[PDB]
């Protein structure tokens, strides 16, 4: 299995998945995801319920955000989970906008768990914001999930800031 240091050195979003669904040997399942602007409290996206790809359709105002709060709920299968860690790398074209390295902590088996994380946005020039709005899906992320420094899940996303 891939270690955090291997993906922390990646300069580009991966072409393909770095692991298989069967690599999720803890049966971690994401059951709710919510993000909110911590400036206004406005909920920006909420969802509750293969499935390793999400396409986000946001508005230009999204790229004026500074601080966004994420709440994640997940269930865990019958094994204990220690040092649950997500490295999420946001790219525009072929370069890193920002790396996020979040601690999801310890989980007991068959448990339902909630975590709160804060995304502080990178500083974006006006030219980069316009490029991102006018190049939908050129902004892309890899979310790499590690338990005890072993890669168990890889989720992908892309982003448009094009919406009405």
């Amino acid at each position: 299995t891939i270690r955090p240091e291997h993906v922390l050195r990646l300069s580009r979003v991966t072409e393909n998945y770095l692991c298989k669904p069967e690599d999720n040997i803890y049966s971690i399942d994401f059951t709710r995801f919510k993000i909110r602007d911590l400036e206004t409290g406005t909920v920006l996206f909420e969802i509750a319920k293969a499935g390793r790809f999400v396409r986000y359709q946001f508005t230009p105002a999204f790229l004026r955000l500074r601080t966004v709060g994420a709440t994640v709920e997940f269930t865990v299968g019958d094994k204990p989970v220690s040092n649950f860690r997500m490295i999420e790398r946001h790219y525009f074209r072929e370069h890193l906008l920002k790396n996020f390295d979040f601690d999801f902590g310890f989980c007991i088996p068959s448990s339902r768990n909630t975590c709160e994380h804060i995304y502080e946005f990178p500083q974006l020039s006006e030219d980069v914001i316009r490029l991102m709005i006018e190049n939908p899906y050129e902004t892309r992320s890899d979310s790499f999930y590690f338990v005890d420094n072993k890669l168990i899940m890889h989720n992908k996303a892309d982003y448009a800031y094009n919406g009405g």
Partner: peptide
């Protein structure tokens, strides 16, 4: 990525 179901 946590938005994936």
């Amino acid at each position: 990525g946590c938005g994936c179901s």
